[PDB]
Design a protein around this ligand. Sequence first.
Ligand SMILES: [Zn+2]
Ligand SMILES: [Zn+2]
Lengths: 181, 182
Amino acid sequence: MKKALICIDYTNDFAAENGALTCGEPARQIEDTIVSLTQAFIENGDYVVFAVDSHDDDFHPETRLFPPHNINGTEGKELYGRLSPLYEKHKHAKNVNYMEKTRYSAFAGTDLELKLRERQITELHLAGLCTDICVLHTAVDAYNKGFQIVIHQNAVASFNPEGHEWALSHFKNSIGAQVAE
Amino acid sequence: MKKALICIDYTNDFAAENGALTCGEPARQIEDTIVSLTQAFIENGDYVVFAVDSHADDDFHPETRLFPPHNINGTEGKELYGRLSPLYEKHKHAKNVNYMEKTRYSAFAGTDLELKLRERQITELHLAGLCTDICVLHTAVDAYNKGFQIVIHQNAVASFNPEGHEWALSHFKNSIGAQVAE
Ligand SMILES: [Zn+2]
Ligand SMILES: [Zn+2]
């Protein structure tokens, strides 16, 4: 179908050794496949959204739960590893969108759905962090919005291995997505 | 602040022994707690929504072909389980009681739940029912994105998957910021 890739929260703070909210080894371990995945989408001309947690704010629900992270302007928010130059190489491309988000789901309070419908996109490929938090919530919205969904299981990770497994099974058995190797 | 209870898919098909999609005993073991909870809300005059899956002749529904028919209209599989059924029948006339059919996992999706919550100025959403890591989870994701305070009644939710159940309760507490009440 018409395809888009949503590349979620692959930042320093979520992957880096001293990431302010780091997921650690599982997150860095996917670096190579998510970079290839994204590059491939970009080069084939498919729509690619870098959906990135963005924080300035005692009104944000997460300020109760978590340390400061993915703060606007800081190195923690930058895309991790080889994904940062991939993006910098392509940030002007028509089929590349850098989209700041304020909740776990890439859809919530954003214009992602608007952009996807403009482009008549019908299949949404999901990659990034975490499998059972931002990828999950995104997939829940995608599901309830009627999109076909592809989870790239070697391009997602979580700190919690059980959550990771649980999520992949949820995507397969409840959401009816395709979980791709 | 103003409270409502969303009592999710506590039906024969999801709880009974012979249920088309039963979670089995753990769904049956919460009957007393979920009935006491729901009755407490009803009698206190708080808003209560029985949110019930209603489907399976539509090859357009994502669920058909990929799940056996369940909570089908007219069938006693759709009936509330156990003592929840006579509680509902006794109060179904009440202004603070609503029966709401839903067609996806989340109680918000394609329903007028949010409309009704706004009208009643509900600020805090209490969730109970089945399954912890499916319908309860999807309802909670939506509730979270729509800005509600969320209370999960741990002893009034259950899943057919024990690992999913535990995972979900930590998710609600730690990611969604819900109160997980015991
Ligand atoms: Zn954040
Ligand atoms: Zn169903």
